[PDB]
Amino acid sequence: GPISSKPVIVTGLQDTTVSSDSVAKFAVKATGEPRPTAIWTKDGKAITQGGKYKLSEDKGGFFLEIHKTDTSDSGLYTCTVKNSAGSVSSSCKLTIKA
């Protein structure tokens, strides 16, 4: 019968430096059946859509932008890609250069 498949990373995150007073961009590529969605965290805390964080998902890409960067934005960013078959994550450390 038809099956589902746990998401699998295609391209993961890597440690990055971005200036302060800028925008940081992260993108994960991943596949899965059903098409998965993403859940992002900053040092284990929820990242949700707003003025600060802009999230998008399209054709196997999962995007996060961090707007108006500042020192506080440094830390561990994790993207968990999930569907009803399970999940997989990818992570990196962001460094903000003043």
Structure tokens at 80: 């968990």
Q: Supply the DSSP symbol for 3.
A: -
Please report the resolution in angstroms. 1.0
Structure tokens at 52: 């600060």
Cβ distance 35 to 83 under 8 Å? yes
Q: What are the backbone dihedrals phi and psi of residue 22, each rounded to the nearest 5 degrees, phi first? A: -145, -165
Task: Find tokens 């460094």 and name the residue.
Answer: 95
Determined by which method? X-ray
Domain boundaries, the chain: 1-98
Spatial CB neighbours of 89, under 8 Å, sequence gap ≥ 6: 78, 79, 80, 81
Cβ distance 6 to 87 under 8 Å? yes
Cβ distance 46 to 68 under 8 Å? no
Tell me which residue of 55, 8, 12, 13 sits closest to 35, measured CA to CA.
8
> Which superfamily, per CATH, for 1-98?
Immunoglobulins (2.60.40.10)
Distance CA 81, CA 58 (A): 13
